[PDB]
Point group: C2
Chain length 166, copies 2
């Protein structure tokens, strides 16, 4: 029932901050992390590594502009040009308020902005800015928890350090 959140972010230090903000916020849609724009487009179009996934758009895309191989703006344009994808809400993760302002000038109907580094308060404020629907839960869905934990571990192994213990 709950659709995933697609987090598109290469820089592993930034990924850490964004996932921690997500964990802290208790936002419970399953996170799916891809690390460049080619992988994001594969996820969204169900190709590549994602060829076998269930049909359906993510609830939200958290889209870093800084992506190797295929830039974040190319992902955003292909999303908004697609009749299938164009309805997906997007939070752009930018480097400065000036960058957010420039992106607004492209008129790609970006729904919200977070200026990096991502912190919990600004992050939740961006999600609130989307003006989409939401619901409270007593229990997180177990697949969501498993996914966050799995990424925390992969990211820890890759960065060769951890910040907390569960």
């Amino acid at each position: 029932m709950l659709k995933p959140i697609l987090l598109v972010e290469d820089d592993k230090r930034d990924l850490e901050l964004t996932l921690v903000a997500l964990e802290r916020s208790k936002l419970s849609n399953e996170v799916i992390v891809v690390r460049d724009g080619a992988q994001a487009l594969d996820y969204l179009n169900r190709e590549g590594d994602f060829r076998a996934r269930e049909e359906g758009n993510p609830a939200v895309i958290l889209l870093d502009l800084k992506l190797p191989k295929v830039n974040g703006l190319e992902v955003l344009q292909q999303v908004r040009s697609s009749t299938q994808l164009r309805s997906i809400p997007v939070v752009m993760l930018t480097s400065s308020q000036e960058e957010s302002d420039v992106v607004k000038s492209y008129e790609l109907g970006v729904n919200a902005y977070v200026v990096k580094p991502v912190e919990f308060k600004q992050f939740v404020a961006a999600i609130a800015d989307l003006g989409i629907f939401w619901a409270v839960l007593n229990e997180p869905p177990p697949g969501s928890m498993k996914a966050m934990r799995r990424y925390e571990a992969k990211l820890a192994a890759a960065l060769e350090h951890h910040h907390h213990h569960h």
Copy 2:
């Protein structure tokens, strides 16, 4: 999957403000309204008008202290004394900050407070104060929408006026 929110509130003018804040916030758990503490306890215990309802606790109780017949504090004590009910998060709707402070002194583990009149911003801040889990949705669940619309209509017919049109 999503559990309802139980709104316990007699005064019809206050009910209007609380439902509008809920509608505006796009919080999408189904609302269930009861108008005094006797009805609230019947809902929670599946008795009375609610004898046939599905098993399960509401996600949140929005509990007005001012209730005819059975007071809101008696509902809160019976909830916290019950091994079945005591885990339910409660937002108390109070008349002043002094009232919130007094209620905190009872040590009934009240999770959040809204000082009436309820407005959208303070309302969402109270829900955030609960520190519970939540999820975003593109579509509200249709049963939720039907329920809000149904109450708006009953409340309009009872107050003999409306404030907006859908």
